[PDB]
Amino acid sequence: VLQVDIVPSQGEISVGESKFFLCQVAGDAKDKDISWFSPNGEKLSPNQQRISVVWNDDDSSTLTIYNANIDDAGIYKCVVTAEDGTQSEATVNVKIFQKLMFKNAPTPQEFKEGEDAVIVCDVVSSLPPTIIWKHKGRDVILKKDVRFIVLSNNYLQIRGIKKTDEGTYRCEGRILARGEINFKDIQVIVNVPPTVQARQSIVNATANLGQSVTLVCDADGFPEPTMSWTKDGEPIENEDDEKHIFSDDSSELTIRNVDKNDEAEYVCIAENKAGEQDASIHLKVFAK
Template identity: 40%
Template sequence: MKSMLVFIWGLLLVITTETRVEIMPSLGYIELNESKVFVCVVEGAVQEMKWLHPSGKEIRDREDERLQVEQADKIVSKLVIRDAQLQDAGRYQCVCRFDESYAETAAVTVTVVQKPTFLNPKTYHEFLEGSEAFVPCDVTGIPQPLVTWKHKGRDVMHTEDGRFLLTAQGLLIQGVRGSDQGLYRCEGRIVDRGEVQSLDISVVVNVPPTVRIREGKVNVTAGSGVNVSLACLVNGHPHPYISWIRDGGPVVAEPGRFGFNSDQSVLTIYAVEKADEGQYTCTATNKINSSRDDVTLHVTANQTEEEVPSPHSTGHTVQATGGQAATVGTLDLMKAQRKEQLAVLQSLAAQQEILVRRVAEIGAEISQLTATLLPVLHSLSPPEKAHD
């Protein structure tokens, strides 16, 4: 029993005299320009606690505004690193002396890091089509981040034409096109720490306007119910302003005479007259340049609407056989009226012939459809029951 008591007493003596020094947190990552506190905790009857700089020099309170030591109590000491800089990286030690001959040390390795950071970010750029476009994206970090670019969700380096080149400060696009316009995303990634920062950049490609008239010459016959549309195909960015000119003067909207669609690329002339004949010019203008194209409108007068002599006019008289006068004007008017009536009758006859032919075609189609469907309908009919 006595030996057992001696063993327990010795064990208690070992436990009570055990010492331990620990620094928290054990990982020494500090963000650049940020502050952090490291706490040194000791177990045991410590006589002295001090912090050593990576250079080996003791860190004394108030000697450096950014590196300070605070003694919370006899067993806790704090090292405060403020506004961390790259030169603050290194191995810091907390040295605890228990008596004249015995001391223990704990250490923490401080690493100054920086998240991916964009320097002087500019998120909007304009370029002229065909030029060399440089989109800046200067990304810094500790360690230096890996930079990638995306356009419309795809890595720009996966394009097949090789016009995209990555540089240390941004993205170079050779011979920029209208299709290159859009939102680009510049990503800075530090793989080891799983940190990603992104910057969205809008790229606008300005394109000079181009104009192309669908038909260079348009022929039309005048008439109260005849309308003609003159169209020009316009491209460019920003979208050009479109205007029309005739005989050196602007063509403006006029109810019942001239009208335009929403962007004025189509000019409609209502109830075309002989006086509307001439050259029309479509002009497209944006902040880059302007472009134009011409269309010639040729109007043929409608004979039925030409001015004819009055039935009551004697017109021009000539001497006929038997010495009697004949009124040429009246005869001409009657001939014109007969010609007009004949044209109407011919038009009606043609329409009737087309109608008859179409009815015959529809009848043939119905017969063919019936011949096709009858076998199908017979196959779907239930079989007749046999009579006893």
Template identity: 40%
Template sequence: FFICTAIGEPVRLEWFSPLGERITGSKRMMIQTEGSRSRLIIYNAIIEDAGIYRCQATDASGHTEEASVVLEIYRKFLPVTMQPRFASNLQMLRAGLLGRVRHEENKASELGFDHRELIHIPICRFQVLPNNNLQIRQVTKADEGVYRCEASVEARGEINFVDIAVVVNVPPVLSVFQQSFNATADYQESVTFTCITSGSPDPLVTWKGQQLEPSDKYIFSRLEGGRSMLTIRNIRQADGGAFSCKATNKAGSQERELFLKVFVQPHITQLKNVTAVEGSAAMISCVAEGEPLPDISWRRASDGQTFVDGDKVDAAREGIKKLINRDIYMYVSFIGPP
């Protein structure tokens, strides 16, 4: 690299190649200008880069002055050795980039991020340590990128560099729009659970429930924006219960529960006609299913008379009462309200 310093207050500092062309800057030839000081850096110099380079300073009146420097290619600079440290997640307080130079002469090193010199950025989170390590405190996703360590020898104008990538892993964040769902069994109804995830790298989403396997009944899908969905088709009573959505990546995992409540309409499953002798007790049996637990009531069809606790129907009433109590204990649900 070459440094050009102008005396006075130049409005423009420009560099010209041995062919007389103005150097505009590129990935291999970089120009860094600060006030009256400009530096031309040539990375990975080749034999064709040898020659006379000119630095031209122009003041406000348009007057120009220039100086020249000769570049001779005669020795390859020893390589830089790097030892990267990657930030694992946002909870890490520090990330280090190590840059060491092996050379028998005096040397200097600088560290940069995306071709910007970090040592000139007034951010307390970035610190170049005495051993030339770059320390980043309270790492955030914005710190992810390519960092460059440059090693130079001022006396001979030699420079070398190595780029190193810092990857910041962000733990998954999982949210759900709706946590509880209701459905009625045996009505061809469907329910869709939705989980929204974010994180870096993109989390892997898994669903847990009652023997969940991809099929016509259980459909898994993933859309843009981190939306993962589980659709349950043709809801039945056995589908009710808890399901979970879990997001996992290298930085951690997060899990949320979702619930499906399945209602079953009252349905009489057993009803038999009864023949009784006048003056005796008759036991009339009625068995039904439903969710939630329905009430059972009795009504005589001939005159519409209803029977509840407190009516004087003697043995018939007692028989009905005992039957209802027994069935409530044995079955989950009963016939619905009258």
């Protein structure tokens, strides 16, 4: 009697992806029923959303598995029933797996100079991945710079990270059985705490002569330090400004019409995401 075949004859679907299968009946005289059954033995209701069974013509029926998940795995079968109740079937083994992909591998990843840096790279795959970390083409391992280590979770550890260690690092995953490869480039940034020094620690000025004085601090670090000042411990707003004028980086503070109220200890605070350092300047104002 009847011939039923499913194309493709077998299938594999990665979690979250979709695949379809066509159950075809041979010759096809009509008035026969075509029904699909899932791996758990249940008959699939036609025209549903995710596990879709769509009759095409009286010759075939298509099973589409959208957004696959592990519980979709198994032998699905297509049964054909002739007007007299005689039945024929074709079965199809559907495997579900997780293709090698990156789940969490942020870029860039930043570290403070000197700390032990751990570069995070989270992969997912049904079969266990072999991970290789690459820098500038090489395998950071085969060089044996004792500071480089691949941890049990496959993250790259760079002990006492140096400013010269920044750059792009490649996290490469391989699955031997499938000869599968996927990789991700991660930019590593090293931040350096600020250091700062006053250009002049002591400054003397004369009051009420309408003159200005410029206080200067020289700082560096990475990212470039942002400067803020204090007058005897009290903040000084960068803002409108009539008296206090700051440079773009605020590394320079210009006091405009100097009078005795300007005499104080000024502190320039240099900060960036990795730290802080300050320096003081003593301004003394003498009556004219």
